[PDB]
Scaffold this active site. Structure first.
Site, PDB file in Angstrom:
ATOM      1  N   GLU A   1      74.416  20.937  15.520  1.00  0.00           N
ATOM      2  CA  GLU A   1      73.449  20.807  14.438  1.00  0.00           C
ATOM      3  C   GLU A   1      71.998  20.978  14.918  1.00  0.00           C
ATOM      4  O   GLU A   1      71.684  20.753  16.098  1.00  0.00           O
ATOM      5  CB  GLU A   1      73.628  19.514  13.696  1.00  0.00           C
ATOM      6  CG  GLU A   1      73.925  18.325  14.584  1.00  0.00           C
ATOM      7  CD  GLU A   1      73.476  17.071  13.905  1.00  0.00           C
ATOM      8  OE1 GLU A   1      73.837  16.854  12.727  1.00  0.00           O
ATOM      9  OE2 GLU A   1      72.713  16.343  14.527  1.00  0.00           O
TER      10      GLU A   1
ATOM     11  N   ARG B   1      79.078  18.109  12.780  1.00  0.00           N
ATOM     12  CA  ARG B   1      78.739  17.545  11.472  1.00  0.00           C
ATOM     13  C   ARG B   1      78.688  18.639  10.371  1.00  0.00           C
ATOM     14  O   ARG B   1      78.833  19.831  10.660  1.00  0.00           O
ATOM     15  CB  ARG B   1      77.456  16.696  11.544  1.00  0.00           C
ATOM     16  CG  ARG B   1      77.561  15.414  12.378  1.00  0.00           C
ATOM     17  CD  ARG B   1      76.651  14.324  11.798  1.00  0.00           C
ATOM     18  NE  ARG B   1      76.810  12.971  12.378  1.00  0.00           N
ATOM     19  CZ  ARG B   1      75.990  12.483  13.310  1.00  0.00           C
ATOM     20  NH1 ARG B   1      74.980  13.230  13.747  1.00  0.00           N
ATOM     21  NH2 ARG B   1      76.163  11.268  13.816  1.00  0.00           N
TER      22      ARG B   1
HETATM   23  C1  LIG Z   1      67.231  11.654  14.927  1.00  0.00           C
HETATM   24  C2  LIG Z   1      67.616  11.430  13.460  1.00  0.00           C
HETATM   25  C3  LIG Z   1      67.098  10.083  12.876  1.00  0.00           C
HETATM   26  S1  LIG Z   1      65.656   9.282  13.227  1.00  0.00           S
HETATM   27  C4  LIG Z   1      65.939   8.003  12.134  1.00  0.00           C
HETATM   28  C5  LIG Z   1      65.189   6.890  11.915  1.00  0.00           C
HETATM   29  C6  LIG Z   1      64.216   6.484  12.849  1.00  0.00           C
HETATM   30  C7  LIG Z   1      63.432   5.324  12.732  1.00  0.00           C
HETATM   31  C8  LIG Z   1      63.653   4.505  11.614  1.00  0.00           C
HETATM   32  O1  LIG Z   1      62.934   3.354  11.397  1.00  0.00           O
HETATM   33  C9  LIG Z   1      62.031   2.930  12.437  1.00  0.00           C
HETATM   34  C10 LIG Z   1      64.651   4.877  10.670  1.00  0.00           C
HETATM   35  O2  LIG Z   1      64.860   4.096   9.571  1.00  0.00           O
HETATM   36  C11 LIG Z   1      64.938   2.678   9.758  1.00  0.00           C
HETATM   37  C12 LIG Z   1      64.613   2.042   8.407  1.00  0.00           C
HETATM   38  F1  LIG Z   1      65.197   2.907   7.396  1.00  0.00           F
HETATM   39  C13 LIG Z   1      65.415   6.058  10.815  1.00  0.00           C
HETATM   40  N1  LIG Z   1      67.139   8.238  11.550  1.00  0.00           N
HETATM   41  C14 LIG Z   1      67.755   9.366  11.957  1.00  0.00           C
HETATM   42  C15 LIG Z   1      69.081   9.812  11.373  1.00  0.00           C
HETATM   43  S2  LIG Z   1      68.753  11.078  10.080  1.00  0.00           S
HETATM   44  C16 LIG Z   1      69.852  12.466  10.254  1.00  0.00           C
HETATM   45  N2  LIG Z   1      70.070  13.231   9.155  1.00  0.00           N
HETATM   46  C17 LIG Z   1      70.898  14.298   9.202  1.00  0.00           C
HETATM   47  N3  LIG Z   1      71.144  15.031   8.099  1.00  0.00           N
HETATM   48  C18 LIG Z   1      71.511  14.624  10.403  1.00  0.00           C
HETATM   49  C19 LIG Z   1      71.232  13.831  11.513  1.00  0.00           C
HETATM   50  N4  LIG Z   1      71.776  14.107  12.673  1.00  0.00           N
HETATM   51  N5  LIG Z   1      70.439  12.776  11.420  1.00  0.00           N
END
Ligand SMILES: CCc1sc(-c2ccc(OC)c(OCCF)c2)nc1CSc1nc(N)cc(N)n1
Ligand SMILES: CCc1sc(-c2ccc(OC)c(OCCF)c2)nc1CSc1nc(N)cc(N)n1
Ligand SMILES: CCc1sc(-c2ccc(OC)c(OCCF)c2)nc1CSc1nc(N)cc(N)n1
Ligand SMILES: O=c1ccn([C@@H]2O[C@H](COP(=O)(O)OP(=O)(O)O)[C@@H](O)[C@H]2O)c(=O)[nH]1
Ligand SMILES: O=c1ccn([C@@H]2O[C@H](COP(=O)(O)OP(=O)(O)O)[C@@H](O)[C@H]2O)c(=O)[nH]1
Lengths: 233, 233
Positions: free
Chosen positions: B35, B101
């Site tokens: 991905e 994914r």
């Molecule tokens: C590196 C990807 C990240 S970063 C992140 C994130 C980072 C910090 C956060 O808070 C400090 C967060 O949310 C916490 C509160 F909602 C999410 N979530 C993600 C998962 S989102 C995602 N969406 C996709 N469609 C694919 C994939 N691999 N990942």
């Protein structure tokens, strides 16, 4: 489907909706796609709910909402123009569909305007521009444009018409903003200097009409140019 | 027809990258499509420059950047998988393409979860789905899966493993974030409680692989179930 695709371009309140609605009455070879954002500009559909919110969200906070609103405006357009193709002007000898604006003013007027006014950052603009390119190709060229009709007008003719339209939220629109929109319309469509990422566009024929003189009762000379423009295509 | 499409699904650091890096080498007829996100996280391409940026911004403020990330993530994943489905395995004995994914992971694990985490408000999540629904639906036979392989790892394991992967911005990942992604993969792929707007996700075979135990130098039994799985496809 042999269909001639014409975009009606021009600044806010030049009279596109006025014009388009006129054109559709003069023939059954002639249909329209109204600009999604205008239908938003208000059981109800799940798109207007979405459009209603994002549209007011944009008024309140353009810097928070322009990317989101641009991508939804354009999507809503792409799917509406493709659905007029597949079921309007069924069926005719000389079918014309008049797009009220186009995926090209979406990006090269408004999105660009918001970026240049810092309502979208660089990442959002390039994402949109990357989003716009691709969304166009996959779901694309069956909307390639045969011609563009520019409802031209000084920007001061437009606020007159804003004031004339009796809409409260718009009374607030500054002359400089319309003048910002206006100038971007002249470089694309009067001077043909705006080079877009679209090859065929540079050699799309453009018809420029002056809509300063109120036409709404007196539109025949404007219609003759369309018909004469339509025979050349 | 006639490249089989199989998505590898798993919690963050469940072992997906490593299972498809191992799988790719085993058959000239097998190729992997990692991905976008996985690859962002470390002159670049436009997407490369944009993807690093939106990850970094999303880290700093999800409730401002989720819609934007999630739109660009799923767009590029489609574009990466389109490439491969258009250029690779062109014609080879028995082609099977492995996706790190899918667009249902994008939507039903990641987008869904951020809306539940209040990182996406209702309008964003409504708009996000519209666009996902209508779009994946345009090329309707094409990215559709022939199978799913689910790697079942525990949050502690995935935790104990975001450890051994030692990326920095990933030590910032809490254990309770991992618990709801688990609850979502279990609910979608194992329990099958999840309702989706792509009807065939009910028919599609799912191979679930308990991948708690280490498996870099002991994968034979896993690949063994993989081949078995495909032989019912
Ligand atoms: C590196 C990807 C990240 S970063 C992140 C994130 C980072 C910090 C956060 O808070 C400090 C967060 O949310 C916490 C509160 F909602 C999410 N979530 C993600 C998962 S989102 C995602 N969406 C996709 N469609 C694919 C994939 N691999 N990942
Ligand atoms: C009609 C809805 C609005 S609201 C808006 C706006 C509102 C408030 C603003 O600041 C307070 C604003 O700042 C713009 C300055 F660049 C823009 N621009 C627009 C037009 S952007 C647009 N994009 C489209 N793709 C289509 C379309 N018809 N209009
Ligand atoms: C052309 C549509 C525009 S553009 C616009 C606007 C654009 C830029 C502005 O400053 C840069 C601007 O300043 C006034 C906003 F406070 C308004 N306001 C409007 C009207 S918002 C609106 N909302 C609706 N719900 C309906 C409707 N007819 N109009
Ligand atoms: O020749 C014209 C052109 C426009 N208008 C008025 O000016 C406003 C703007 O027109 P329209 O909504 O068609 O503009 P658009 O936003 O579609 O360009 C409307 O109240 C029209 O009735 C008019 O009275 N006569
Ligand atoms: O049996 C295993 C499986 C994975 N890993 C390590 O766990 C880290 C992250 O796992 P991976 O990238 O496979 O997870 P993904 O996010 O790709 O599911 C990597 O450094 C792997 O080398 C490991 O040590 N033993």
């Amino acid at each position: 489907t042999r269909i001639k695709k014409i975009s009606i371009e021009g600044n806010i309140a030049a009279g596109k909706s006025t014009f388009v609605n006129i054109l559709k009455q003069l023939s059954e070879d002639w249909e329209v796609v109204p600009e999604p954002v205008a239908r938003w500009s208000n059981e109800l559909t799940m798109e207007q709910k979405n459009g209603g919110n994002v549209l007011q969200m944009m008024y309140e906070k353009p810097e928070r909402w322009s990317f989101t609103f641009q991508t939804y405006a354009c999507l809503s357009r792409i799917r509406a123009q493709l659905a007029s193709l597949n079921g309007k002007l069924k069926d005719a000898e000389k079918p014309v569909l008049f797009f009220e604006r186009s995926v090209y003013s979406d990006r090269y007027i408004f999105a660009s305007n918001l970026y240049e006014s810092e309502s979208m950052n660089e990442t959002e603009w390039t994402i949109y521009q990357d989003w716009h390119d691709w969304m166009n190709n996959q779901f694309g060229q069956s909307l390639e444009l045969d011609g563009i009709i520019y409802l031209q007008a000084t920007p001061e003719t437009c606020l007159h018409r804003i004031y004339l339209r009796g809409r409260n939220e718009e009374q607030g629109i500054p002359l400089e903003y319309l003048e910002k929109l206006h100038y971007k319309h002249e470089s694309w469509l009067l001077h043909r200097t705006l080079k877009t990422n679209f090859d065929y566009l540079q050699e799309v024929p453009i018809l420029t009409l002056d809509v300063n003189e109120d036409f709404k009762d007196k539109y025949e000379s404007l219609v003759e140019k369309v018909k004469e423009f339509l025979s050349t295509l």
